[PDB]
């Protein structure tokens, strides 16, 4: 909400003036933020997967999706159609809500001295990192939970290149360093 | 992308109708307008057409791109097909769901008298 | 060839029946279907499927 | 002895040997030895002919082998009746048509390549001739 209209007014002007875009549309936007855990211990028991789904629902709010195995790889003794991970792709108002609750409070708690990697782009404009610590977001208490499994986020953007993506993410509060 | 997916959706019926050899009512829906036309069994000549891009029909509504305009265009197609005398047309959804605005137009024509 | 042969008996008073096969260990529950009865000329339920 | 690493099938039909060779030009080296008749060419023969010229030039120039034994040849034991299935593979052979280039050499003088190919032809069963790279 606040960051939605903040991208609308200002921010967009910063990028426009920086990259001398002819059209407003050339400025990169943000479409989705994908949450992914992929515990992988489901081969031991299904309760771990259920607990993982509950934990990720705590952050997301509605429900997570369970992802099945695309192949029966013998190396990880996985069977086709065996749920081994959970995921969410929030979008729109909920997306901006989670982005606010993330940037405002969670990121400062994530190793203020480091924050995250500045070079974490794929090459097109995507921007992803692993929280590795599901206690940061505190929405839900963690003095009762059993495991401290991690978490991964990936921001998708329509940026042409990594330079454009990095400029857009800099325009926000993402400290990078 | 989306257009290619729609064509992929519609191909099977599109040509099953020609295999059966019947005149087909084809509808093309856009966010701003809607078109309908009766295509002959050979699929080369158009017998009747009507949309929201003409002065008539489009000058007597609120906004082209709603179910009311779809019903108006369906009425137009039904009346013009009846004038030409063609009957027993096969409606095709052209890859669109039948429940949306395409529900109208079809309903309007079948109540007008076109044998859906 | 563990699959065995069973007969589906019309629920109507007619003695007409069909024959088919089913697995005993995998689905021991009785099979219920709706098939045409040539004697009464109607679709009726069928039972007697071990 | 040269032979394929793996075989899709272990036995093959006899087949015939008709027509002219396909690769008839000196492509890799500067001098070549090309057949004039038709017939079989075994791995043992190819290996002996290779040694002939390789030792004729000792350590000089480069040598290419253009032919390769591809089809297997079967043979049933001595005191065995006719029939009772096909024989068992004993050796590998290469079918060669007239005009097929067999060996090539680059880094040697003509007056030495000629003698090396003469020695190799002495071993080969089919008659051959000496050819030059020339141009198109």
């Amino acid at each position: 909400a606040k960051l939605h209209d903040y991208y609308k007014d200002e921010v967009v002007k910063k990028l426009m003036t920086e990259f001398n875009y002819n059209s407003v549309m050339q400025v990169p936007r943000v479409e989705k933020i994908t949450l992914n855990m992929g515990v992988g211990e489901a081969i031991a028991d299904k309760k771990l997967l259920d607990n993982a789904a509950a934990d990720l629902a705590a952050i997301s709010g509605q429900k997570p999706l369970i992802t099945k195995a695309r192949k029966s790889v013998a190396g990880f003794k996985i069977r086709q159609g065996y749920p081994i991970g959970c995921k969410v792709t929030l979008r729109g108002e909920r997306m901006w809500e989670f982005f606010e609750r993330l940037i405002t409070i969670a990121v400062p708690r994530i190793r203020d001295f480091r924050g995250l990697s500045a070079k974490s782009f794929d090459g097109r404009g995507n921007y992803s990192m692993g929280v590795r610590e599901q206690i940061i977001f505190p929405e839900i208490d963690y003095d009762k939970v059993d495991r401290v499994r991690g978490l991964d986020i990936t921001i998708t953007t329509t940026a042409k290149s990594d330079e454009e993506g990095r400029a857009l993410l800099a325009a926000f509060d993402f400290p990078f360093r | 992308d989306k257009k290619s997916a729609r064509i992929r959706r519609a191909t099977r019926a599109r040509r099953k109708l020609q295999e059966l050899g019947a005149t087909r009512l084809v509808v093309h829906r856009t966010p701003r307008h809607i078109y309908a036309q009766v295509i002959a069994p050979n699929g080369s000549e158009v017998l009747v057409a009507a949309s929201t891009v003409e002065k008539a029909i489009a000058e007597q509504l609120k906004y082209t791109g709603n179910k009311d305009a779809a019903a108006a265009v369906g009425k137009a197609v039904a009346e013009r097909a009846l004038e030409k005398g063609i009957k027993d047309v096969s409606f095709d959804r052209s890859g669109f769901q039948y429940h949306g605005r395409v529900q109208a137009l079809a309903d309007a024509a079948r109540e007008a008298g076109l044998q859906f | 060839g563990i699959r065995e042969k069973i007969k589906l008996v019309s629920s109507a008073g007619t003695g007409h029946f069909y024959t088919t096969t089913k697995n005993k260990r995998t689905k021991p529950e009785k099979l219920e279907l709706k098939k045409f009865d040539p004697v009464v000329r109607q679709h009726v339920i069928y039972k007697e499927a071990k | 002895m040269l032979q394929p690493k793996r075989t899709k099938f272990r036995k093959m039909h006899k087949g015939r040997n008709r027509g002219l060779a396909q690769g008839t030009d000196v492509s890799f080296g500067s001098f070549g030895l090309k057949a004039v008749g038709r017939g079989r060419l075994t791995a043992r023969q190819i290996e002996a002919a290779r040694r002939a010229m390789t030792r004729a030039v000792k350590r000089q120039g480069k040598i290419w082998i253009r032919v390769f034994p591809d089809k297997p040849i079967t043979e049933k034991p001595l005191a065995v009746r006719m029939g009772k299935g096909k024989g068992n593979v004993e050796y590998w052979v290469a079918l060669i048509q007239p005009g097929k280039v067999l060996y090539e050499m680059d880094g040697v003088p003509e007056e030495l390549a000629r003698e090396a190919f003469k020695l190799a032809a002495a071993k080969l069963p089919i008659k051959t001739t000496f050819v030059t790279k020339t141009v198109m």
Binding site: - | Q18, G21 | - | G85
Partner: protein, 79 residues
């Protein structure tokens, strides 16, 4: 080891062109088990459960190649 044991009765490949049978729907004008390169051209009724083409009523049988992928269809000229 082991030989012989070859299947028998590979049926048929081609049963005619033009007005060879003509009358009624026929049961030829198809390479059974083929499908590819022999499709129903609409003029003749579709395949059977075993991929067998046949006519509607009458007419000459013709072969054409049309459409994407350059597939061959069999049609019948109604008369």
């Amino acid at each position: 080891g082991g030989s012989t044991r070859n299947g028998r009765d590979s049926e048929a490949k081609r049963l005619g062109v033009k007005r060879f049978g003509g009358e009624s729907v026929l049961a030829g004008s198809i390479i059974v088990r083929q499908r590819g390169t022999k499709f129903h051209a609409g003029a003749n009724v579709g395949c059977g459960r075993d991929h067998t083409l046949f006519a509607k009523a009458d007419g000459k049988v013709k072969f054409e190649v049309k459409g994407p992928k350059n597939r061959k269809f069999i049609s019948i000229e109604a008369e």
